[PDB]
Design an enzyme around this catalytic site. Sequence first.
Site, short mmCIF file in Angstrom:
data_model
loop_
_atom_site.label_atom_id
_atom_site.label_comp_id
_atom_site.label_asym_id
_atom_site.label_seq_id
_atom_site.Cartn_x
_atom_site.Cartn_y
_atom_site.Cartn_z
N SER A 64 0.93 -1.31 0.01
CA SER A 64 -0.04 0.07 0.07
C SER A 64 0.93 1.15 0.03
O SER A 64 0.50 2.40 -0.64
CB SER A 64 -1.05 0.20 1.38
OG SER A 64 -1.70 -0.96 1.36
N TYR B 256 1.74 2.95 -3.10
CA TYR B 256 0.58 3.77 -3.96
C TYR B 256 0.50 5.05 -3.42
O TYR B 256 -0.45 5.91 -3.67
CB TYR B 256 -0.79 2.75 -3.47
CG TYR B 256 -0.89 1.67 -4.54
CD1 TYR B 256 -0.32 0.35 -4.08
CD2 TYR B 256 -1.47 1.70 -5.92
CE1 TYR B 256 -0.51 -0.65 -4.95
CE2 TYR B 256 -1.77 0.44 -6.59
CZ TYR B 256 -1.11 -0.83 -6.12
OH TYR B 256 -1.23 -1.61 -7.06
N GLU C 151 -3.89 -9.61 -1.75
CA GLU C 151 -4.83 -8.49 -2.14
C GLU C 151 -6.09 -8.87 -1.55
O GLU C 151 -6.66 -10.15 -1.82
CB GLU C 151 -4.75 -8.40 -3.45
CG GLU C 151 -3.90 -7.30 -4.10
CD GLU C 151 -3.94 -7.10 -5.63
OE1 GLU C 151 -5.15 -7.13 -6.12
OE2 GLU C 151 -2.80 -6.68 -6.08
C1 LIG Z 1 -6.31 -1.89 -9.77
N1 LIG Z 1 -5.27 -0.67 -9.96
C2 LIG Z 1 -3.94 -1.01 -9.53
C3 LIG Z 1 -5.83 0.49 -10.42
C4 LIG Z 1 -5.76 1.45 -9.26
O1 LIG Z 1 -5.52 2.64 -9.63
N2 LIG Z 1 -6.53 1.11 -8.30
C5 LIG Z 1 -5.87 1.25 -6.87
C6 LIG Z 1 -5.89 2.58 -6.34
C7 LIG Z 1 -5.33 2.71 -4.91
C8 LIG Z 1 -4.75 1.62 -4.41
N3 LIG Z 1 -4.52 1.37 -3.02
C9 LIG Z 1 -3.89 0.50 -2.40
O2 LIG Z 1 -3.42 0.68 -1.09
C10 LIG Z 1 -3.89 -0.93 -3.05
C11 LIG Z 1 -3.43 -1.97 -2.15
C12 LIG Z 1 -3.50 -3.28 -2.84
C13 LIG Z 1 -3.88 -3.48 -4.14
C14 LIG Z 1 -4.32 -2.43 -4.88
C15 LIG Z 1 -4.57 -1.06 -4.24
C16 LIG Z 1 -4.85 -0.06 -5.04
C17 LIG Z 1 -5.22 0.14 -6.24
#
Ligand SMILES: CN(C)CC(=O)Nc1ccc2[nH]c(=O)c3ccccc3c2c1
Length: 323
Positions: A224, A227, A301
């Site tokens: 996380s 991100y 996930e």
């Molecule tokens: C599915 N995607 C990568 C597009 C997207 O922008 N979504 C997104 C957007 C924010 C995200 N934030 C997270 O903490 C996360 C953690 C584990 C798996 C995915 C996420 C996450 C996914």
Amino acid sequence: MKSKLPKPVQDLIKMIFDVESMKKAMVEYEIDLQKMPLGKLSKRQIQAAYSILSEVQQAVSQDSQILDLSNRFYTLIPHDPLLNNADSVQAKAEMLDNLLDIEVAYSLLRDPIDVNYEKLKTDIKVVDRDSEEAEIIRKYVKNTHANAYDLEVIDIFKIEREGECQRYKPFKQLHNRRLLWHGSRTTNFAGILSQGLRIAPPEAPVTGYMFGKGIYFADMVSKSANYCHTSQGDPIGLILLGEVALGNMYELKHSKLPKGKHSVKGLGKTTPDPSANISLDGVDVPLGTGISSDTSLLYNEYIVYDIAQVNLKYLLKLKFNFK
Ligand SMILES: CN(C)CC(=O)Nc1ccc2[nH]c(=O)c3ccccc3c2c1
């Protein structure tokens, strides 16, 4: 008049409502701020850009025809790049997913600090460093970290979203309620606290989501933390902790949820040690060190497809170290 809010909260409100951070992100997203300023940004055109971005995704059936609509997107969103590839659509999909949370942020925005705290409609209480819950939160960061950067918790906030508890109420009877992470960009958090954690609209293209449109979570803090989109310049970022009523999990290695299941678990290579799992408030907290689990994923996930299955409990102001 002199605000009675604590300094870590006062500074957090300044951070999540930073006008310069918004314009900075627009420059990095190549958006021409001269033909379209921060103010003239509207939801009606963001949603329109999506329905044109999904039409490029529709160009799977059939190059001259694709560029006729590819440039039409750049008409709505000024840029200062051909959209035909699946990677090109996903890149602009993440951009619109970020831009909408900035349009929401500046909509709310348009003493002063106390009005902004109340504008968000959330109770943000500072968690003491000496408290039991601070040790459990710090252990969850220190043990579930994968090594290219190091994490140190600056602040811990107990966030009580308005009207979220009564929304979460029916899903509280579900089994397997876990405390998981949700990392996002520092700019989005103004929208995350007012509107809450949401799912992508039907206008948006499905290509970008591995397990379809839902609310994505992880057990490993480092997953996380990537991100957060934190750099050497500005290493301070914000990560969430929410009660996710998973219940009947649909375990996937690689349609819509079978009649009986309530969540999806994308199995990973490394999982936090199950023999080192603490069940705080009847909610599983996997703060153990990473041990090995064919699997097409990094780590685990957790995806829920109902906005009410989530109950945002904590917020962490993290500092990123770059080696
Ligand atoms: C599915 N995607 C990568 C597009 C997207 O922008 N979504 C997104 C957007 C924010 C995200 N934030 C997270 O903490 C996360 C953690 C584990 C798996 C995915 C996420 C996450 C996914």
